[model samples]
Target chain A: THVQGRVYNFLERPTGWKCFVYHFAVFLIVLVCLIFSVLSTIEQYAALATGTLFWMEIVLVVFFGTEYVVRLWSAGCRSKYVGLWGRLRFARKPISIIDLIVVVASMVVLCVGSKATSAIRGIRFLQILRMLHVDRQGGTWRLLGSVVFIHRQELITTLYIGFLGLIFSSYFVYLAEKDAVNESGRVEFGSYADALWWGVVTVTTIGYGDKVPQTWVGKTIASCFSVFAISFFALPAGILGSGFALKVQQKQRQKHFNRQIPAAASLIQTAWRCYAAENPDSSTWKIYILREHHRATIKVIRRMQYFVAKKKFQQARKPYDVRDVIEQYSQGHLNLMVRIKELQRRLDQSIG
Target chain B: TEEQIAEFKEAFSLFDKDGDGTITTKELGTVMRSLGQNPTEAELQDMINEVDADGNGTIDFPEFLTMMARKMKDTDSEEEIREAFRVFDKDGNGYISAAELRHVMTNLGEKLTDEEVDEMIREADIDGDGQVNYEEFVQMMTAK
Candidate 1:
């Protein structure tokens, strides 16, 4: 869990300068590669840049391969993705599935090389889908996905009932108008299929005057069907509306409680510390105190990690690594790495 | 000069959590805590101003590096204190015995007698535990 947790933090919830730089560096590289892939297909640059593009893409795909595997490995820390079966479940996620497509697509591109395949480029667009995940600010996608998922049964049942209504409406309309004649001397509701199309148009509230029932019984059936559709369709709409509202409220409340638990834990620590100070030699008391504090400290540590992740979290005025600068520059643009280092030296000498 | 600047760069990046080329008070607090030093808001507030020469309320790389050099010249950081303790302890034990102390002093080209090293320990070891523990060593170093 130690290494897994660190990897997860670095990729998804960067809390330090090094990790933040690393995450953004990857983001920038992905953006650059995606743009290059797009530009490669344009008529102006189509055939001119495949050599550099090929090398660029090969490197990018290798980086992405490592990224995808590490993400999958670290996701094991979560109970939802804990074991082999759990991993398959994670891979089944839409984003994960898209990521897999991207890796495979890029690999195929590398194999084909220089002469880009139209099919491969089409599949390469899935890399754009990964930007939302890499951005790490895709809570809305998660929220919407979960709401739809949790309310699936209700949503599906409502759709089923609505479909049942449509079937009934179409059948009755067909029975009434199956023999009706049109002014053009062709039978209206020419077949059961015709009535089914009319049923859909009527229920959905847009009538294409090309298919109207001529008989009184047929018109009556259409009227009742329209009324039934209005009421029946509202069921799924309300189900989803309530589903979103409930999920949103659940998230807000969870955040509120997340905050309150830490506050309560701190309060307990204050009281416990005072009690322990008074009975320093009480071995059991001290041991229990340590256990309680350990649990509380873990909670505090989690909170601190998040606080560090917050953008506004301030940092100290202290020294950092040149390696980050060199590594970042070397990733996609090595010339700048040497140029900046040289410039930095000159600047340092002048200051001294 | 390049090596010194690189050293300064290494120290500055650790505190610049967001990597926006500047350090803020909150990042400093996080770093201090990570380094096992819980800094009070008062100290952090004071420390920022002490280094922020342009009165920008932020610490840039240049400002951080300059202040780092100054601190190296002016005061011993906690790291150096621990480093000195480790030097004297010599055996990975928590305490620095007189024999280990004499060995360290001798290695530094000072031919110190056993009596001199024992006297030095006697002065620092307030608890009289016969050897200088970390607490005593810190006091010994810092008292200067």
Candidate 2:
């Protein structure tokens, strides 16, 4: 906030070239960390010459560390998310925690200089959280987030019940199959832990087939768990579907006021924007703008046919046409339509 | 007593295709196509955007009647029935094929069994090759 509002704006939007490069570099860092994490997990590379690797990791950690700090610090500038609590609100966020962890664990290595087998193993999993920051930036992901937010209670309940079912299912399968002989004449579930794994796999409905029941009793219980798993995933569908339907309806209503009506109002805006004369006709400037796109006459006439009826529109291109249609379209609830007309008249003097 | 189904009634049924006494842009498009002109998706979307309904993108009978009031005319008599059958000839190839019957009926949300559709066709399809022309449809509608 102190040094770089413009740069902060650039990084936040990714619209300007500088913004894009900032995010691009951020993404590159994310990928580098992830790859290093995986490599470290599988097998760490031969010892690097200390200064280069040391500085490289520190700079990357410092870059992320700075980004994380600035994001939290800048939260104060946003009207909606301004305050000490607002700063703390995002501190627990997945991306925030990940960045903090990435920076801390890396800096800890720089400090202790301990390459203990235990240390890198713990850090490897924490490293992949970098991309979790990347995922929520897109449109589909945002919509998904909205859906989840809308249906959070149903989803949480569903998960809660599903979680209980897994524990039971795991326990039952463990008992039923722990000693059952397989085709190889060995027990399918050599231990309760094996049954626990089989139960989890079956209840999730993934049906890995690596651990199926050898006993009829085990198979019977497994079938029941599979059915339970099927319904568990399906319960959220109705909730999500209805939420999206509501979202679509709200958008359509808002579109009428915001977009469809606004386009027609734009005509009035253009007419005035062209020339705000008291007289309806005889203005060269207005004529200049209107004739500039006289081609709109044919397009307007072509649209005239649809204007004939339904007072209901699927897609209204003109605000004026929508006026009467909106009036008759939802007459009983036509106040909004009437309100729209009033807004148009008030905003653009020519059409109103 | 057939004082014509009324103009709006005719257009309503002509487009209701499903016979559910309601209409959707999809049915409306099929109706326009059957009338010798295919409307663009933009036109259909425009019509849908006008009607204030739920997310199904449909207009009930009242909405359809009020909305399409300009296009609907008084329904004519038995003669109009022939005109109606002609309108049902969606592809304009001159035969009201079983597919067209099913298509039109679907607009009304009618869920007819194959047997139900086939039975109606068997009686109406005088030529018996699974399609009905004007004469066969007239015979089916006007017969006892």
Candidate 3:
């Protein structure tokens, strides 16, 4: 039988389970890629383990390609597999586009690129696009999108500044060091692009210590650039943290908006039950209203569970205190018997 | 309050398997295993860091109690908990059916087949009534 009102063919039968496994695998791959990327960028020998990295990349690409083909075949359109153009159109879709990019980039490196140009394999940075799947599927996209957008301008500016620093620092270092080497005229800073390499390492605060500026003027410039690099990294981090906080607040507001109507109705119903109890004077009626307000707090607690399931405010909101609400209602000036009956009804309705 | 404290203390003693007055990584693993959880080394370390008070790298009874209290406060409310139970009770019989439990366990990453699910149900059904109540459900999960 179709489990959730869909065809139960083997291909589609385990789609939800498949999706969950795929997501977990993607998370693991991305995490490993991140660690490897950091290590490769830090040390040359780590990058030299290209054999293992290349094989892993190929495996990932093949898996994604197969998944893409299956999705294409299972797509709603009857003519989905009609022609190259149709297949191209299908593959151009967002998720398919990421798969294609990863697969094609890996193929190009393996087929045509040489070891000298293998550094282009760093284009696997494109796989960071897989994070979009997590954002979208988990409904954390809004928060993630907001954080990325808020930091985008600063991050771009920082990158541009870093590029310029690399150029200038490399040029200056080459000018000072090129003359000191045996290949003086041939190795002048103007001809050597190795200056750019040193510049990048310094500006990134990596400072591999392999390359150094021997001249007093070059060393002075390096000192100043280090301070700038520190601030450069800090700028985007600060923006992202602030943006994350704003997104959390936005999520909480959205959650509250969705819950407020249902919660208020539940509260009002409880209040009506209290009013039906012993008729009282205006002063006592006000106290009865306060008591009903306390009794309705359970509705708020229930609403929080819904919010948590949606992962809207897992960290920010506290759970409801039903005991305190019941206690307050008991001690109030309201008709205790009637309020207790109302609470019981509410509980039964809720439990049922 | 005193009874509540005593219950919490008993829970802490269960966690502190070595009776060292603190729950270390090995002790925490024992408790987790008893709950049918097999956390990785990194996960275990992270849990310790999150729950350990006084930066002692271990959980004392008070720290364990506080962590459990926080978890209770943060988890689903009574109504939600009831709803979750109902959802697990797939046959609408106020108890989890074998089929329902199997589906849930599979979704949680178990690779149980239908036959395995049925066998488990027979083994776990304490009342021999062919239905697993919520208490039975908890026991099955913890005893796994």
Candidate 4:
């Protein structure tokens, strides 16, 4: 019974319409947040004065809160919304986590932290997590996730080597340049923490030049570390660029598939219209036949688009050409092929 | 005349299924069926594609109503909506009559009795005429 109900719901038209509308709304809200974030970054002081950033955060939290409530209500069981277990499950969801982080970060700044501290304003960037929800919901989450996963090994290795190089280089620079300054290098070796900061900047090749190696030995070490830093940074950039290109190619292919589906659906509908207009049969019977033809054509086009959109062309099992669609309907009906051919000719002419 | 416009507004609201202040191709298709015309999906799509100037894939209520009114126009200017009451009053009187109602229904293939049709004509004939002209006929057909 449960399985039957689930199938019925899945096949339902209203459910699909509602889901599409919901997804569109979510897309709009996230796009707005993205635009606001860019503007805020460009003019930080103005963004604060305008309160655009704050309102965006509030809106996101409200939207997420409402979404959580709706999901909980629709889950179909009391246990689903009961106890700490329910809360934990909800929190573990990626979107839920993003919502919590955005809301919590804002609350911390507004409620817990003092207004005098400007550092708390940094939490406003947490709204960028909304983009993750948008990407995941749109089914492009794996594209980004895979890119990060593929570079994990190289990233880890770079970080490990980079860390060690920083510590050692910072120590040498401090020992070499400490006495050359007025402070007589007393503060240079005063703490390992100070050396750690200098080490990081040196290995990354930031070379702020605030801290320098005055001794010959320290200068020699800096020259050698610079070469390694170049490769460390370049490797990750190359990997990400390649991954981004692949992802973009996949998205373009999906868009092409979506576009083609509507064109094919339109052609099939036009063919059905021409058939019905000429038949002049019993209105009820013709309406039924026309509706069936419409559904079958839509189903075929949807299935083809779905497979192609996922880049699963090999699993599609059969080739789908516009000719095949027209041919199937033309088999028993005379002159249908002529009409279909006319449509094809028109389509061809329009393309060039 | 103002009352007729109000009735049109109500009719338009009934047609706007999603209540998003717009009528989409799908919504217009449903409305056309209620009016005894089963427009093909291709026809509906073509209408929407041509009418939806912004390409936002739907027509707002005003745009959808405007399109309907334009379809009823017999002239190029499409300024017929302003004189809707006058055009629908088939008998050329200040009001509409039973004969005028039958004429409008004839165009729509609706067969009606003298009494039933008279009631509709009386209800819609705002100007108190015993008969209707073209403007009053349009107003009666579009009346809520």
- Cα deviation at A304, candidate 2, in Å, is 43
True contacts kept of 3: 0.00
The candidate scoring highest on TM-score is: 2
Docking class of 1: incorrect
Ignoring the other chain, what TM-score does chain B have in each prediction?
0.49, 0.37, 0.47, 0.40
Q: Please, what are the lDDT tens digits per residue for candidate 3 over residues A34-92?
A: 55555555456565645456666667667767765665565434355456677677666
In lDDT terms, how accurate is model 4?
0.59
What is the DockQ score, from 0 to 1, of model 4? 0.03
Candidates 2 and 3 compared: the better one by TM-score is 2
TM-score, chain B, model 1, is: 0.49
Candidate 1: stretches off by over 4 Å:
A1-10, A14-94, A109-142, A145-157, A179-188, A206-215, A246-352, B1-144
How much does each candidate deviate from the true structure in C-alpha RMSD? 27.3, 20.3, 22.4, 19.1
Error of model 1, residue A305, in angstroms: 32
What is model 3's C-alpha RMSD?
Answer: 22.4
Over A27-128, each residue of candidate 4 has an lDDT whose tens digit, in order, gives 787777666666655555654633665656666667776665555434334355455677566557676677567666666655554342353355446656
The order of the candidates by lDDT, greatest first, is 1, 2, 3, 4
Off by over 4 Å in 2: A1-4, A16-18, A43-55, A66-101, A114-119, A122-126, A135-145, A152-179, A183-185, A190-194, A224-229, A234-253, A256-352, B1-144
DockQ of each: 0.01, 0.02, 0.02, 0.03
| Candidate 2 chain B lDDT trough over 10 residues, lowest sum | B68-77
**Per-model TM-score on C-alpha atoms:** 0.37, 0.43, 0.34, 0.35
Q: Which digits, one per residue and each the tens of the lDDT, describe model 2 over residues A111-222? A: 6764455555555555654566654335666798889997899999987887788788778878877767778776778877788777667765677888888778887887
lDDT of 1 by residue, A1-352 (tens): 8888778777766777998788788788778767876777678987755555667767777888998898889988778889999989978877777778878877876676545466445535645664765755357677777778988998888788878989998999899998888999998797889989987777767788889998899889888878877566778778878987865665542222223333444555554544454443544243443354665554465455445434211112212346545756677577767789999999999996
Interface RMSD for candidates 1 onward, in order: 16.1, 8.0, 18.0, 7.6
